Design a protein around this nucleic acid. Structure first.
Ligand SMILES: Nc1ncnc2c1ncn2[C@H]1C[C@H](O)[C@@H](COP(=O)(O)OP(=O)(O)OP(=O)(O)O)O1
Ligand SMILES: [Mn+2]
Ligand SMILES: [Mn+2]
Length: 425
DNA sequence: ATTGTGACGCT
DNA sequence: AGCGTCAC
């Protein structure tokens, strides 16, 4: 009823760079622009593993996780850019530094939560109030929303439809009510157009975005119209949108929890969750998950945009699959040193840029025969940014996992070093 | 023989 | 603390 909180208090956007690693390589190498092309890691096994794919290449069926040899079967003219190799492993520095370029621009407009290397949430609530006060009642022109889709419109050529839906939306707006959530979302979308224009002018990178009242809806919205477009998902659009939305498409429901929601309740679509009481959902999925589901299927989520532009952890990982598994102590020591040297480089740079020091070193490994991705995770003190010391300490901490009696058994299929627990410096 | 990350929850 | 889930 009237006391029914509608979860319409905030304006939240999710900005995601289109095929980000590919764009980084296309900026650097103009020969790759506007072409089917992908970014690959390594090159020996089946041509390398594809980790990013241009939209031209996606049209042929090329996807992430595909081997390059197989992608070339689908797309014989596919162009490839290789991830840099340093110290025997893939090194993602070029893409981290490009991400920082973009995040720094986004931070001029509003508070950002770095959600991954290529995407960030934006809390636009205060920016919208400021922009509304600056407007003082004038209507919002379609010209201010040149790449915006209004989800669910029009109702009652793709660009033609986009413009029809946008006109229907803007005609319907009550511009004189500064408290209308729909108006607030629209102004948020204006600001996000400006943000996206700034990113493209100052980096060359294009991105898509979602604008809604919370992070889950903003992330869902972002994927509705890609690439190089943005989508506004209003509170009112939620019943129709969710009525045919597979549960696995909502952030955090793509895994075993979503599968159990489907199996236990006997439903397929997000909207079907509205038929259950909060207590019913809590009984199946726990107190937190149940309350979250009960609100989220109504379009309501309260998870804040956290003020956090930097990663909380700095990690270095390598898999050693099949016959590359490590079977000698020297092999284990040498790779621990390689990882620790990349970690030391990145940490020293982080301490200089961001005025902080890590204090905990996490060491994880995967043993051949383990079906788990991580077999053992142990922590030690990180007291100095010294690669030899970090590697000696990781060895000291994992050494009792060798069940042999110079050899290493069972052979190691993964090494992982992660610097955590940062404190101001 | 998806790899290399990175955030967060549970107990 | 160590392990598990989820998504890029
Ligand atoms: N499994 C992975 N392994 C390594 N890198 C990955 C993996 N998944 C995603 N990435 C990298 C490459 C991507 O360019 C970057 C951003 O991821 P993501 O937003 O999901 O897709 P994308 O930016 O490549 O295309 P788009 O967002 O337009 O669909 O992170
Ligand atoms: Mn992306
Ligand atoms: Mn992304």
């Amino acid at each position: 009823g009237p006391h029914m909180a509608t979860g319409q208090d905030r304006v939240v956007a999710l900005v995601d760079m289109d095929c980000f690693f590919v764009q980084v390589e296309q900026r650097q190498n103009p020969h790759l622009r506007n072409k089917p092309c992908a970014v690959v890691q390594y090159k020996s096994w089946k041509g390398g593993g594809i980790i990013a794919v241009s939209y031209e290449a996606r049209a042929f069926g090329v996807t992430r996780s595909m081997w390059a040899d197989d992608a070339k079967k689908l797309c014989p003219d596919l162009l490839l850019a290789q991830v840099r190799e340093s110290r025997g492993k893939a090194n993602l520095t070029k893409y981290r530094e490009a991400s920082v370029e973009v995040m720094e621009i986004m931070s001029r407009f509003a508070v950002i939560e770095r959600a991954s290397i290529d995407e960030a949430y934006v809390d636009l609530t205060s920016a919208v109030q400021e922009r509304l006060q600056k407007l003082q009642g004038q209507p919002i022109s379609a010209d201010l929303l040149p790449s915006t889709y209004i989800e669910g419109l029009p109702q009652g050529q793709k660009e033609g439809m986009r413009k029809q839906g946008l006109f229907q939306w803007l005609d319907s707006l009550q511009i004189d009510n500064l408290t209308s959530p729909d108006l607030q979302l629209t102004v948020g979308a204006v600001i996000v157009e400006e943000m996206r224009a700034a990113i493209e002018r100052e980096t060359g990178f294009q991105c898509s975005a979602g604008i809604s009242h919370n992070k889950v809806l903003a992330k869902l919205a972002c994927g509705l119209n890609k690439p190089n477009r943005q989508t506004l998902v209003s509170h009112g659009s939620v019943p129709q949108l969710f009525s045919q939305m597979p549960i696995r498409k909502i952030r955090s429901l793509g895994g075993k929890l979503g599968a159990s929601v489907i199996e236990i309740l006997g439903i397929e679509y997000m909207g079907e969750l509205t038929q259950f009481t909060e207590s019913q959902l809590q009984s199946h999925f726990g107190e937190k998950n149940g309350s979250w589901l009960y609100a989220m299927c109504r379009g309501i989520e309260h998870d804040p945009v956290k003020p956090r532009q930097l990663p909380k952890t700095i990690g270095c990982s390598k898999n050693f699959p099949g016959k590359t598994a490590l079977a000698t102590r020297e092999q284990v020591q040498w790779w621990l040193l390689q990882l620790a040297q990349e970690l030391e480089e990145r940490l020293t740079k982080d301490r200089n840029d961001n005025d902080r020091v890590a204090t905990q070193l996490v060491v994880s490994i995967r043993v051949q025969g383990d079906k788990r991705l991580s077999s053992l995770r142990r922590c030690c003190a990180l007291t100095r940014y010294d690669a030899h010391k970090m590697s000696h300490d990781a060895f000291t901490v994992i050494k009792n996992c060798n069940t042999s009696g110079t050899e290493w058994s069972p052979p190691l299929t993964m090494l992982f070093l992660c610097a955590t627990k940062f404190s101001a410096s």
